[PDB]
């Protein structure tokens, strides 16, 4: 019964994080993905 596991890697990419009324991070934009997010 082999189960699955995913693996990714990190990179130094500036993010803009959206905080809510509870001080919780609920969204983010990756400032180098595409011209729009840029």
């Amino acid at each position: 019964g082999a189960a699955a596991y995913y693996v990714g890697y990190l990179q130094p990419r500036t993010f803009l994080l959206k905080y809510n009324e509870n001080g919780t991070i609920t969204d983010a934009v990756d400032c180098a993905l595409d011209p729009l997010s840029e």
Binding site: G8, L10, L16
Partner: protein, 59 residues
């Protein structure tokens, strides 16, 4: 076996408290929609490559 890292991989960059405010910071993150590796057996050894995102679902 690749996969779409849609948006996961966001984390709290520091122990400081903010609310109802947008803040832009630079740090190590997982690029959006990047590919991920899928394993299901054969468990090889894996480079750590300056940080590692791991996810799974109880072996």
């Amino acid at each position: 076996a690749y996969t779409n890292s849609f948006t996961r991989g966001v984390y709290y960059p520091d122990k400081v408290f903010r609310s109802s405010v947008l803040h832009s910071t630079q740090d190590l993150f997982l690029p959006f929609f990047s590919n991920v590796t899928w394993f299901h057996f054969d468990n090889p050894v894996l480079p750590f490559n300056d940080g590692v995102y791991f996810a799974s679902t109880n072996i």
